[PDB]
Amino acid sequence: TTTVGITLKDAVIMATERRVTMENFIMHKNGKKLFQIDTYTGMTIAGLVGDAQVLVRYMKAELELYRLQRRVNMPIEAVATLLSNMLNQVKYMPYMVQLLVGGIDTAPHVFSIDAAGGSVEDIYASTGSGSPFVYGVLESQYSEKMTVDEGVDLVIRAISAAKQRDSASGGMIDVAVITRKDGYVQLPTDQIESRIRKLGLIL
Amino acid sequence: TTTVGITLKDAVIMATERRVTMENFIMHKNGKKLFQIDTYTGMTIAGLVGDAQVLVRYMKAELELYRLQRRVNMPIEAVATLLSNMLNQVKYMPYMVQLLVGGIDTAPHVFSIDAAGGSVEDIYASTGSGSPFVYGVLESQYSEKMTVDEGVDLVIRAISAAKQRDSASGGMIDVAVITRKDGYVQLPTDQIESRIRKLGLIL
Amino acid sequence: AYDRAITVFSPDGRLFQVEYAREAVKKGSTALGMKFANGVLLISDKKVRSRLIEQNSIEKIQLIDDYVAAVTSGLVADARVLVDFARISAQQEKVTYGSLVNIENLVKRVADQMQQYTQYGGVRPYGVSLIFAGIDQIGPRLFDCDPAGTINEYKATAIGSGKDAVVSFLEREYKENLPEKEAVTLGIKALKSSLEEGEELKAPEIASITVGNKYRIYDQEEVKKFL
Amino acid sequence: AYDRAITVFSPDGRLFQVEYAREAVKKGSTALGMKFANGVLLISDKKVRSRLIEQNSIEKIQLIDDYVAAVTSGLVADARVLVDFARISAQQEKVTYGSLVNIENLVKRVADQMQQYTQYGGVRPYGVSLIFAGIDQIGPRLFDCDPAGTINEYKATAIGSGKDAVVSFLEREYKENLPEKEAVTLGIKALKSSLEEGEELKAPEIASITVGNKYRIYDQEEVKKFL
Amino acid sequence: AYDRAITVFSPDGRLFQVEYAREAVKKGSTALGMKFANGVLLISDKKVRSRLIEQNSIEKIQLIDDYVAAVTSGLVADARVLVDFARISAQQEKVTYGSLVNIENLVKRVADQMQQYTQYGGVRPYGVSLIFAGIDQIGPRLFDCDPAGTINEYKATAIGSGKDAVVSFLEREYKENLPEKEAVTLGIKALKSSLEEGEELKAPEIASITVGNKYRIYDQEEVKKFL
Amino acid sequence: AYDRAITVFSPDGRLFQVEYAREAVKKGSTALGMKFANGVLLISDKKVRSRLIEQNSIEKIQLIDDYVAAVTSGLVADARVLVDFARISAQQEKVTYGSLVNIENLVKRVADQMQQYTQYGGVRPYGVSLIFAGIDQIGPRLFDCDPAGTINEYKATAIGSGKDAVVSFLEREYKENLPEKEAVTLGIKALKSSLEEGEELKAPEIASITVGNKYRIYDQEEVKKFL
Amino acid sequence: AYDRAITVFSPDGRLFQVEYAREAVKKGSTALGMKFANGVLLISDKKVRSRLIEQNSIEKIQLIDDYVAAVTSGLVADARVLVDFARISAQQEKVTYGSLVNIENLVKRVADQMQQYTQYGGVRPYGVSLIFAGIDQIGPRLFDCDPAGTINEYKATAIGSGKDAVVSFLEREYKENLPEKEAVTLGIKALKSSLEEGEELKAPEIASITVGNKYRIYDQEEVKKFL
Amino acid sequence: AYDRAITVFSPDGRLFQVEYAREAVKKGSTALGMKFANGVLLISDKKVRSRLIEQNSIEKIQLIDDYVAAVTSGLVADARVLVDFARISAQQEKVTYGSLVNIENLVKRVADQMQQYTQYGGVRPYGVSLIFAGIDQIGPRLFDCDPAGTINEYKATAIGSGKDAVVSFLEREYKENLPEKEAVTLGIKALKSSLEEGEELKAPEIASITVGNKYRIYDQEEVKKFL
Amino acid sequence: AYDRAITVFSPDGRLFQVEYAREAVKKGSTALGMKFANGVLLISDKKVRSRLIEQNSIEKIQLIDDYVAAVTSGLVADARVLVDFARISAQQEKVTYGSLVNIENLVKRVADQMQQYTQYGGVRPYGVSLIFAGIDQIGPRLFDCDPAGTINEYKATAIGSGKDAVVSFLEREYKENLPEKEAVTLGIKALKSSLEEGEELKAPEIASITVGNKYRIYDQEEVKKFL
C-alpha cells in the first residue's frame, strides 16, 4: 500500500491508493484507505485492514463525541496524541498499523503515528509499502511555496510512481484536500483522471 | 540517535539531534527529543519513540501536579528516582528507552536512567546510538572549569562528531541550557547555526 | 409509609418513589417536538435568565449526533448525566454498527439505564424526562423517555410543567406532514397555550432536521419571526 | 407491619410484597389467548389513546420470535424490560440448540428471572404478568408467567383487570379445536363480557399462528369484522 | 418485635421467620408417600381446577430422575425453583459419580441450599416442603425436606395442610411390606381422613417404583379404581 | 432494646443474641459423655417418636470418623450443617496431615466456624452445641462446643435441657478410669436424674471407643440391659 | 421525614439532602469572578484570621494548572479533596490529549464526580461549590460547579453567602470587555455590596489571566490599591 | 439512643459501644503480671470450678511462644479467637524475620486487629483484654491490649474485675527488680486485696520467665506455698 | 434526629457526626508547637500517671522520621492507628521519591485517609487531631490535621482541651524567629495559661529540630529547667 500527506500554505493534501491485499493475491481493486475523521481532519490507512478500520471507527467516535460535548473541533496534536495513547496502551497485543492523521485547526498539520504510538509532525509524511518511492519524488520535487493545485499534482505524481514501482500499491488514487475555507473536500474521480491525463501518467 | 547532558559550574547543558527512525529509512528529518519537563529541569530521549513520548507526558504530568500541590519544584534526584520506579515497576513488559534527566535545584545535576530503571549521577552523560563518539570528545575536551559558552560549543562539537560518524544521528542540533538565573532557555536555531559556522563544522 | 423506598409496592400496587421522580420532572420547563413532512423538530421554552450566563450552556436542546438530538426536563444534574449517557451510547452504537442505524436502541440504552435505578435499593431514579428526535434509516423519529424508563414513539409530544396542556392542544389541532414553517408555528401556539395568564412567551429555542440533511438550530432572530 | 420487605413472611405465611406486585398487574388492561385446531392466538384490549402516538409502539402483543410471541399487563417499564429479556433468552436458546426447540424453557428463563427478585432484599419484583404463545416441536403452547414467576400451561387464559371475568367466561364456554375464526369470535365475546356497563369494546389487537406457518397480526380492518 | 428478620432469635431462642415459612408450607395441599415391599410410592391431593389448564403442568409430583421423584407443598414459585435445583443437583451427582448412587446426598444438596437461606439477612427462606422418594443402590428411600432444611428418612409421611392428620392415621395403621395395591389403598384412606366434612376426595395423582424398574404414574383411570 | 443485633453490647457488656442461641440449645434433648480407662463414651436421650421414622436418621450421635464422633442439641437444621462441617474438616485435617492426629483442631475448625457468626451482622449464630469424643495420638478426648464457639476439654459433661442436672450429678459422683460397663451405668443414672417426675427413661443411644479399637454403637438390646 | 436519605424524593419531587449540601455551601465566604477583554479573573473575600496561620494555605483561589484555576466555598475538607480531584483530572486530560485543550471537561470530570454522590446511598454529597476560570483553545472560560454537580458557563458569578447579592449587583451593572483594572474594581464593588452594615471589606485575594499569558495572583499591596 | 452502633459518636464524643465491650471485659476474673530483675511473670485468679473439667483447658494464661505468653479477661469465645490470632501472628513474625525479634509488634498485629472492629458497622468489637509478657532482644516486656486496641507498656498491671484495686495496690507498693519469689508474693498480696469480704483466695495459676530461659508454669504445689 | 449518620446533612447544612468526632478530640490533653529561627518545636502536656507505666509508651509526641514528627489528641486507639499510617506513608513517600522531599503530602496522605471516613456510611471518622512538624527541602513546617481531614500550615498552634486558650495566648504574644530557648519558654507560658485554677503544670514532653540537624527530645531534666 501507499499513503501520502502533504502540508502546504493554508491546506493539507492527503491521498491513498485503493488496493487491498489481505493475501498475496490482490483481492479488492477498490478499497477505502482515506477516511474523514472529523470536519477538518482526515486519516489514512497503511496497515492491517481490520485493526485499521477499528481504529478509524474509534477515532470517528471519539472525535464526534468531542465535537458534540465541547462544540469545537479537536486539535491535530490532540487527536494524534489520543491515537498514540490508544496504540500504546496495548502494544503487547498491538495493532499492526501505520497511521497518518492530517488536518487544519489554526495551521495545517500532518502527523505520522507508528504501531507503537509514536507521533511526530513533519511537513510531508507517507506510510505504506510504496512509501519510499513517494518519499523520493517528494524529496526531489516538494516545495513549501506550492499552491493547492501544484500540491495535488505532486501527490498524484507521487502515488503514480509508487504504483509503477510497487506491487501492493495500485488502483485508482483518491485524493482529498482539506483546507480551512472549504473544509474537507474529496476530489471526484473524473477530476483525478483529468489530472492524470494532463500530467501524462496514463497508459 | 544521540543525546548529551553536561553539568558545569552553575548550569547544565543538554542537547539532542533531531532525526527519527522508526525504520531503517530515516523518516523524520526534524524530530523532538529534548523536552522541558519542569521549570528548572529537562529530559532527553534516546529510545523507542512512542514509549519515550508516553514517559515524557507522564513526567510532565507528575511534575506539574507536584509543583501545583506543593508549590516548589521537584529535586533532580527525586524526579530521577520517580522515573526509575516507573521504569522498574514494569520491566517484563518494559519501556525500551534510554533516558537522561538534567536540571538544577540547588546544584546542577544530570542523571542517566536505563530501561530497567537504574539512575546514577555523572558530571556528563550521553544516551543513544551515537553516544560513544560524544563520550570520546567529552573525555578528551571536557573541563569542569568551563563557562556556559564553552560548554555549549563543546556540546555542538560533540553532536557534530556523532552526526559525522553515525547513521541514525543527524539533523539540526537543538540545545537548551538550563541555569538557575535565567531558567530553562532553549537556544534558537540561528544561534546554533552561528556557533556551527564559527566552530567550522558546516559543509 | 411506603413512599420511602424505591423497592416497595403499595396496597394498590404503586411505586410512589418512581411517581415522585415523575413529579420532579413536572417542575421543569415545557419542551415539545413533532415530526412533519420529511423530518422532525423540537421546541423548548426558556424563561430568560441572567445575562451573565453564557447562552451556549442553557440550551435544553442538545445534539447527541449530527443525526440524533434531544431535550430534557427535571433535575439539571441528572439531566446532564443523561444527555452524556445518550451521547456515549450513540458513539458505542455507531462504533459497533458503523453508523447510528436506528434511533430506537440508542433510546433503549438510555431507557434501560433509567429503568434499572427504579428497581434496586440504595439508588434513586433519575428525575428527568427526555424527548429524542432525529432521522435514521427509517426516517423521522420522536420518542419520550420518562423516569421509570418507559419509551413510546409519537408523532407529537411535550414534557415538563405544561405537558398536559400542550398534548391537549396537539391532541385536537396537530395534522401530520405540515411543511416545516407551518409545523413550527403550530408548535409555538401549542407552547403558548400552556402558560398562565399574564405570562408572555419569551424566545424559545427551536431546532429541526429534514431527511438527508443535518441538524440546525434556528438562531434567535429566525425564532423572533414567529413571536 | 410485614408488607414492607420482600423477604419477610407473615403469621399466616404470606408474602404480601409479592401479592402487591400481583395487584400492580391487576391495574393493566385485559389480554387473553387460547390454542385451537393447529395453533394458538392472542387477544389484547386497548382503550384507544392519543392519535399523536405511533400505533407501532402501543402494541401489548410483541413478537419474541417468528415462532414465539407474548403479551403483558402491569407496569409498562418492567413490561418492556421483560419482553426484552424474553427476546434475548430466545436468542440464547436458539444459538445453543440451533433452534427454539421448546417454548417451555424460554418461559423458564423468564420465570426464574422474575422469581429471583421475589427473594432477595434490596430488589423489588416485576409488576408484570406475561402470556406466551407459539408453535414448537410439540405444537401449540400457551403459558402465563406471573410476578412471583409461576408458569402454567393452559388451553385458554387472560391477564389484567378483566382476568377473573374472562377466565370465568372461558371456564364455561370454551371448546377446544375451533377453526381459527370461530375461536377468535369466542375470545372476542370473552373480552366483551369483562368490561363495565356503558363501555363499548374498541378495536383490540389480535394475532395468531397455525402449525407450520409464521406469525401474523390481524390488521385493524380484519379486526373490525368481529366487532 | 423479633419476627421481622431471619437472623434474630427470641427470649426462648426461636426463629420465627423460619417458622412462618413452615406456616407457608401448611397452606399447600396434602401430599403423602410410603415405601413398601420393594419400592416406594407417592400420593398427592389435587382439588381439580380450571379445565383450561393443561394437566401436564399442575402435577405436584415431578420426576427428578428415572429413579428419583418428589412432591412439594407451599409457594408455587419457590416450589418450582426447588424441583429445578433437585434436577440440576441430580445431574451433577450423576456426572461426578457416573450414576445417582444414593438419593441421600441429592437431598443433602437440596437441604443445604434451603438451610443457607435461613441464616443470612437480605434473603428469605423457601416456603416449600419436599418429599423425595426413589430407588438407589440401597433400595427404597423416602425423605422430607422442610423450609429450615431438615431432612429425615421415613417409612411414611405427608406434607401440606393435612400432614398432622395423615401422619396421625399412618402412625396407627401403616404396616410395612404391603404389596403395592394394598399400600396405595391404605394411603388413599390416609388422604381421605385428612379432609373436612362434606368434602369429597377428587382424583389424586399417585406414582410408584419397584426395585429394578423405572417410574410410572398411574393415569386417571387406574387412579379412578381406588375411589 | 439491645437484643436485636448480633453486633451490639449492653450496659453490662452482654451479647444477648449469643445468649439466645445458647437458649435455643437448651430446648434440645439431653446428651452426655465421659472418658474412662482407655476410652470415651457418649449417651444421648431420645424420647421415642413415630415408628414411620427410619431409626437410622434420628441418631443424635454421629460418626465424624472411625476415630472421632459427636452428638448435638438444638436446632436440627443447624445441627446437621454442623456435623457436616465437622466431617469435612476431619477429611481436610486427614488429607493435610495423613491422619486425624489430634481431635483438638478438628474441634478448632468447628469452633472458629461457629464463633465467626457471633460477630458479623447479617448472620445469625448456630443454635447448636456439640460434644466431640474419640481417640487420637494422645488418647481419650472429650470436648463441648457451644454456640459462641467456646470449647473446653472435660472428663465428663452433658448438653441439652438436662445439662445442669447431669453435670450436677457427675459433679459429685463421677470417678475416673471406670471399666466401660460401670462407666455406662453411672452415665445412665446421670441421665435418669435429669428427667422430671413421672417420666420413664426410654431407650437412649450409647456408643464408645477403647484405645486401639474402632467405634461401636450399642444396639438397642445391649442398651436394654442397663434400663 | 424524607430529608434523611440522599436517595428519596418528596411529594413535590425534591431531593432535600442535595439541597442541604447546597445550604452547607451557603455558609462559606463569598467568592466571585468574571471574564473580560481577553481573559478572566477571580475575587475571593477573606475575613482575616490568626496571624499564626501561614497565608500560603488560606487561599480560597487555587491553581489547577498554569492555565486553569478555581475557588471554593463550603466544607473545607471536601473543598480540598475537590481541588485535588480537579488537579489530578487536569493532569489526566493533559496526558491523554497532550494539553488541557478545553476547560469544559475538566469541569465535567469534577461535575460527574460530584453528581455521583447525590445518587447512591451510603454516600453523602460534597458540600462545596467551585468556580473554574481560565484560558483554553477557545478563550476565556468561567464555570460554576455546585453540590449536585450542575455546571454552567457564565460571564460573571459568585458563590458563598453573598452570592445572591453579588449576582444581583452584576446582573444590573456588569458590562463585558472591560480592561482588566476596571473589571476588577467593578468586582470589588460587587463584593462590597454583599456585606452587612458596619462590616468593612478587608483585603481579598484576586487573580487573573489574559490570553496567551500565564496566571498571576495580585499580591496584597496591588490588592490594597482598590480598597 | 447512640449506644446501638459501633460507628456513631455522642454529644460529648463518646463511643459507647466500645465502652460496653470494655464493660464486658470487667466481668472476667482478675489477672495480673509484672516484670522484675531479669524477667516478667503473670498471675491469674481462678475460682475453682467443676472437677469434671480437665484443668489443661481452663488456664487463662497461654503460651504464644516459648518466649511470649499472655492472659485474657472477658468473653471466652473472643478470648480464644484472640489467643489464636496472637499465636498465628507470632508465627508470621517469626517466619518473616527468622525469630520473634520484638514482642511489640506481635501485640501490634493483635492491637490493629482488635481496633479495626471498633470502626466498621456490621461488626462488633472483641470483649476481651489481653496482657502480653515475655523476653525479646530488648528484655522483659509487659503490655495490655484492651477492646479498642490500645496497647501500653507497663512494669505492672492487671485486667478483669479487680483491675482497679490491683493497680491501686501496685501503684503504692510495687518496687522494681525484686528477685522472682518476692515479686510473686507481692503480686499475690495484690490479687488478695481485690476480692470481697469473706472470699478466700483459691489457688491461682502463675508463670514466669527469666532472661535467657524459657517458660515455666508453677504447678499447683509450688503455687500452694504462697497461700 | 440527624446526628446519627455520617452521611446526612442538616437544615443548616451541618455534619454533626464529624463535629462530634471533633468534640472527641477536645477531651484529649493539650499539645502545642511552633516554628522559630531555623526550626520547629512541639510541646505536649502530660498529667503524670501510674509509675507502673513505662514512660516510653505514653509519649504523645512520636517520630514519623528522623525529619518529621507529630503529636495527637483524642481517642488513643485511633491516635496510634493514625501515627502508624503517618509512618507508613512517610516510608512510601521516601521510597518513591528517594527522600521525604516535602512534609506536605505526607500530611496529604494522612488527611485524605481521615477525610474519606467522614463521607461513607458504615464507617466512623477518626476522633483524633494531629500536629505535624519537621524540616524539608523548604524548611520548618507546622501543620494540624483535624478529624474531617482539614490541614492548614501554621506558625504556631495547639490541639486538645486547651487549644482555644493556647491559640488565644499565641495570637497576642507569639513573635517569630525566636532563638530556640526563648521560643520554648513562650510555649511553656502558653501551655500554663490553659490550665484551670489550682492546677500546677507538671513536666511536659518537648522536642525540636533545627535546619540541617536531626530530632531530639529534651529529657525530663532539661525540661525541668523551664518549670
Residue numbers in the entry:
A (entry chain Y), B (entry chain X): 1 to 203
C (entry chain F), D (entry chain G), E (entry chain A), F (entry chain B), G (entry chain E), H (entry chain C), ...: 7 to 233
What does the published report state?
In archaea, the 20S is composed of homo-heptameric α- and β-rings, and PAN (Proteasomal Activator Nucleotidase), a homohexamer proteasomal ATPase, is the RP found in many species. We designed and assembled in vitro various asymmetric archaea 20S, in which one of the two α-rings contains a point mutation, K66A, which prevents RP binding to the α-ring. Our studies reveal that, upon binding of a RP with a conserved C-terminal HbYX motif to one α-ring, the gate of the opposite α-ring opens allosterically, resulting in similar proteolytic activities of 20S singly capped and doubly capped with PAN.
The point mutation E102A abolishes a specific interaction between the so-called activation loop of PA26 with a reverse turn loop in the 20S α-subunit, thus abolishing the capability of PA26 to activate 20S proteasomes by opening its gate. PA26PANc activates the CP particle in the same manner as PAN, except that it symmetrically engages the 7-fold symmetric α-ring, and thus avoids a symmetry mismatch between the α-ring and the activator. In both our structures (with and without LFP), the distal α-ring, that without an activator, also shows features that match an open gate, with all N-termini moved away from the pore and pointing upwards. However, unlike the proximal gate, there is no rotation of distal α-subunits. Rather, the conformation of this α-ring matches well with that in the crystal structure of archaeal 20S proteasome in complex with PA26 (PDB: 1YAR20), except that the gate is in an open conformation. The surprising observation that binding of PA26PANc to the proximal α-ring opens the gate of the distal α-ring is consistent with allosteric action.
